[PDB]
Amino acid sequence: NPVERYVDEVLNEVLVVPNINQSHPTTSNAAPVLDAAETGHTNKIQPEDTIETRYVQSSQTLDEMSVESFLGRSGCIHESVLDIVDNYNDQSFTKWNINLQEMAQIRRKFEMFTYARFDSEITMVPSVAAKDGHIGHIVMQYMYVPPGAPIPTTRDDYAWQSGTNASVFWQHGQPFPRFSLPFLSIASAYYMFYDGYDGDTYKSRYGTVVTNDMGTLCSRIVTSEQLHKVKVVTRIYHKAKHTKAWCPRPPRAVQYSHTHTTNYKLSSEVHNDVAIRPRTNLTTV
Amino acid sequence: GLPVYVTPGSGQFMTTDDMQSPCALPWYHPTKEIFIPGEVKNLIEMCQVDTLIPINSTQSNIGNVSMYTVTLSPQTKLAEEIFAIKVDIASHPLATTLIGEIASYFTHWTGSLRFSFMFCGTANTTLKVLLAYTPPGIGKPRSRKEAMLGTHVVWDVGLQSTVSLVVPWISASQYRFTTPDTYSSAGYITCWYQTNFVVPPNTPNTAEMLCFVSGCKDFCLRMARDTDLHKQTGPITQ
């Protein structure tokens, strides 16, 4: 019943955890506690098998641990800066090669899977700093330039006409812009990792940079030059919707250093590069 | 509350929008409607009524009733031209007629026009005239023979004083601009003597004729606009 299912959604009780059943003393030549990790399988032994348990009714749910929930939270993926210092025509616009690799927090989460397929919700948070006292009337234009489309080279470039590309215009004072994007890959899933090259020569590129080109985000302050200089910082937040993930992997253990690569740096004292805290010895808790 | 998405356009004021708004005088009950003769429901009702064309609006005639009359008289040369005007609904001298004024509140027009003419000479004055309409794509006719090749009516003056010439809708496009536009100029209407103005002795040797215009069943105007036939150059005070 879509209604009963509905109630489960409101209460977040879609995935319940099993109860613990009462168990009793045993004397048998069947030893569940014994197994062989060599097989590659995890011993499925449960509490009832090793101790005398009571009956307990579980009310915990796994809804919040779902992949949709894990990746369904908006996080920052880019901080775009437009700092008008001394040349409005040059400093009033910029561009960014889109990717989800510049901010560790969300990058690490997605990278716990090998492949993932999802729709995206983008929310933008622009903040105008009045460097000289006034901000006047700020209007912004965020244009998505898919790979191949002409990238504007000046604040009045014809490409800003956006005759086909999708552009979003925001007016200072109005609520934060937000829009959705469908799964964009030319493949069936996004590659979080890619053990391949774009060629077979010593100079061929390696990794996700070969497969994850998302194009460019071009921004510009639509308003023409004003007396008072401003610094506009637009933070882009991303959230995955209708998510699917495949082949889980270990979490990143060391800091990230670059985009599209698993490269890392190690100091002379490696224990400082990982979250593992040295133990005094084996018996010191 | 219910999540909403404010759409572009919100908060704007478009003079032609059609929204609802709270009433400033709640509970107020309007005065009862009574029957008043002459209700009008559509402007077409006014475009179908004949009004006079100030056809003789030469500078010296303007400001005189004579600007509404055309004078006829015995000719010494045959097939002489009497008058000629553009058929364009909002061009001069059609502009200030009722249908021309209304058309001037719209951008597009279409349909057929009805031109009528009333002879005002004596009951003993006779005359045969040729009224012709020349569709576009050619200059106004220079002679009766040239005009006669187009749409026309030969009017014989007699017991019935008036005649009507219908200018059919002959256009490439379904509509035309009401304002003067080369592409959509509708053509001309010319009048010529078919025979001659003839009278017996002791009878005035000249006579007047009145000209009317109205729209036919297919007349129609489109795209409301402000008129350029009236202006305000200063404040209107109490």
Partner: peptide
Amino acid sequence: GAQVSRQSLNYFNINYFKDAASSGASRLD
């Protein structure tokens, strides 16, 4: 989330979000 009642005096106890915490004050007793 609409708890449509009928009596006509129809009631529409709508819950706009999908979490129980989101709803307003509770009914009594």
